[PDB]
Structures are given as C-alpha cells and as structure tokens.
Design an enzyme around this catalytic site. Structure first.
Site, short mmCIF file in Angstrom:
data_model
loop_
_atom_site.label_atom_id
_atom_site.label_comp_id
_atom_site.label_asym_id
_atom_site.label_seq_id
_atom_site.Cartn_x
_atom_site.Cartn_y
_atom_site.Cartn_z
N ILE A 28 -17.81 -41.28 -9.91
CA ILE A 28 -17.34 -41.31 -8.54
C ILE A 28 -18.44 -41.79 -7.61
N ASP A 140 -24.30 -30.06 -11.92
CA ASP A 140 -23.17 -30.78 -12.48
C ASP A 140 -23.21 -30.71 -13.99
OD1 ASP A 140 -20.77 -32.09 -11.89
OD2 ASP A 140 -21.70 -34.10 -12.09
#
Ligand SMILES: CN1CC2(CNC(=O)c3c2[nH]c2c3CCc3cnc(-c4ccccc4F)cc3-2)C1
Ligand SMILES: [Mg+2]
Length: 290
Positions: A28, A140
């Site tokens: 993204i 993450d």
C-alpha cells in the site's frame, strides 16, 4: 559500538543495476521489482517509495536495523527521478524462499513439530529484540512480512517492511504490539488458525470460548499456553516484554523442545480459502493496536 550512517546515492540506479519489470511484491506504499547488479550479476530486490517524510523515516529506521541476521538487509539507497516523481529506490537482499506460512502449508508430510515452531519464534524474536533494544518498534509484524532467504529447508527467516516502524523513546508501550504479533504468530504456528473470534469450513474458535480448543491443542503443554497468554495479554502494561520472551525456557532452549507433531500444516491446507481473511483480520487488528 559506532556504525556508519545512511549515505543516499544520487547517481541513476541504472548505472549500477539492470532494472526489470517483474514485480516481487505489492505494498500500500509502492512496489518491489526484480533487479541484477551490472558488474557482479548478483540478484537483488528493489523497493520503490515516493520520497516523503514517511519514506525517509522508513529507510532510516530500516538502515539501523539492517545488520540484524533476521532482518532483511539494505544494500544501498538511491534518490532518483522515476516516471516524473522523486523516489527513494532501495536495494535489498533477495528473499525468494517465500513467506513463512506458505512453506509450512506446503509440507507434503503435514509433519511440523512444536520444536520447529520454537526455533522459528526464536528467529522472529531475535529481530524484535535487536529493534527493541535500539528503541525501534516495527509495528507491522505479521505473516506477509516474514520471508525466507531461499527455498532450502535451512533458509534464514527475515523480517521485512519498515513502513510502520517508529522510534519509541519516551513511549515504551509502542513496543507492545510487536509482542502481541509474536503471540499471534506463535499461536498460528502451533495450530493453523489465529486466536481471533471471527461456510463449507470448520469454525476453529467459537465466539467467546476458551482459547485453546482440544482438537489441535490437546497435546500442547500448559507452559506453552501460559507463554501465549502472556504475549496476548489485553493490557499493554501487563503484556510480556521481548526480554522476558527471549529469556523463556521454551525459546532459550528451542533446540531441546519436544518434537510434538502438530496440526498446523494440515489445518493451513484445509483452511487455505480463509487465509486472506486471516491476514486481513490481522492487518485490521494491528491498525488498532499500534
Ligand atoms: C506483502 N509483501 C511483503 C512486501 C511488502 N514490503 C516489503 O518491504 C517487502 C515485501 N517483499 C519484499 C520486501 C522487501 C524485501 C524483499 C526481498 N526479496 C523479495 C523477493 C525477491 C525475489 C523473489 C520474491 C521475493 F518476494 C521480496 C521482498 C510485499
Ligand atoms: Mg540483516
């Protein structure tokens, strides 16, 4: 000890590398393409970011992390113009062994053991430890960002993607969500599904039910369950830290952990149509734990 700072190269990356169109990942935030060093012909990976403050922070924090044996290495970073936009082009070591769980899922034996899971968690744990001790939180840590160096059974596992990493000085609880990630990963390793309450497929955890369902958990020790519970603790003030984790006997003596055969590989195959959903639940969850 003292280490060198990041020197961003300004020369065109094509002076140094051949740049192909093969995409080796999507994010993204940009893409990853295949490339070869021109003089040595070694293969490498290229991560492309549009230059901005966030991209600069990603590169800087990842640069600090780079020498860790369980974090993917940055070879060089370039600031170039591409397709009419100013970019940071990041050259990294090639990691073509696939993602952690694909491998496990593909095991034709369906023969994955508690010990193997331990050794994997020690690896991930070492990355997190390296980071947390220099006050960086990754934020993450999840299946898609764990990749192997090669298809070799003996390939090294590497943590990738510094897109959410931050310095944690004075906000120590930023590190906590990295620990919850470890809890979740460890749980999936041990049974094939995540500890999430969430047609033509078995329901693995019923809504609100005890977290370690007998079919898959019956042979796993209470000690291991206690370790998971400490990592998954709701309150960041009470959740296990990386120091406590790497000091746990199950991690510290990973190589001498029982080789309990586990349901993990068969469940991953059985439930493979639900994996995207798993990854998406974890991503949404992360966004709220960060
Ligand atoms: C969702 N996936 C993970 C993804 C997103 N963010 C990253 O930093 C990232 C991602 N993939 C990679 C990296 C950097 C290191 C890296 C190194 N090598 C590869 C790679 C190289 C050759 C063949 C297949 C590969 F996946 C792929 C990556 C794409
Ligand atoms: Mg490294």
């Amino acid at each position: 000890h003292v280490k060198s700072g990041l020197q961003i190269k300004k020369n065109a990356i094509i002076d140094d590398y051949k740049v192909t169109s093969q995409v080796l990942g999507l994010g993204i935030n940009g893409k990853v393409l295949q490339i070869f060093n021109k003089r040595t012909q070694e293969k490498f990976a290229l991560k492309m970011l549009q230059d901005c403050p966030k991209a600069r922070r990603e590169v800087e924090l990842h640069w600090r992390a780079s020498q860790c044996p369980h974090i993917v290495r940055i070879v060089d970073v370039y600031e170039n113009l591409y397709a009419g936009r100013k970019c940071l082009l990041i050259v990294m070591e090639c990691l073509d062994g696939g993602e952690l769980f694909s491998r496990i899922q593909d095991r034709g034996d369906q023969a994955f053991t508690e010990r193997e899971a331990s050794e994997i968690m020690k690896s991930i744990g070492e990355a997190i430890q390296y980071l947390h001790s220099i006050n960086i939180a990754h934020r993450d840590v999840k299946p898609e960002n764990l990749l192997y160096t090669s298809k070799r059974p003996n390939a090294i596992l590497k943590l990738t993607d510094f897109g959410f990493a931050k310095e944690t000085t004075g906000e120590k609880y930023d590190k906590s969500c990295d620990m919850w990630s470890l809890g979740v990963i460890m749980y999936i390793l041990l049974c094939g599904y995540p500890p999430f309450y969430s047609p033509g497929m078995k329901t693995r955890i019923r809504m609100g039910q005890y977290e370690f369902p007998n079919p898959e958990w019956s042979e796993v020790s209470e000690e291991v369950k206690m370790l998971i519970r400490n990592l998954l603790k709701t309150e960041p003030t009470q959740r296990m830290t990386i120091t406590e984790f790497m000091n746990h006997p199950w991690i510290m003596q990973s190589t001498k952990v029982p080789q309990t055969p586990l349901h993990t590989s068969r469940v991953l195959k059985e439930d493979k149509e639900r994996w995207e959903d798993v990854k998406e639940e974890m991503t949404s969850a992360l966004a709220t734990m960060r």
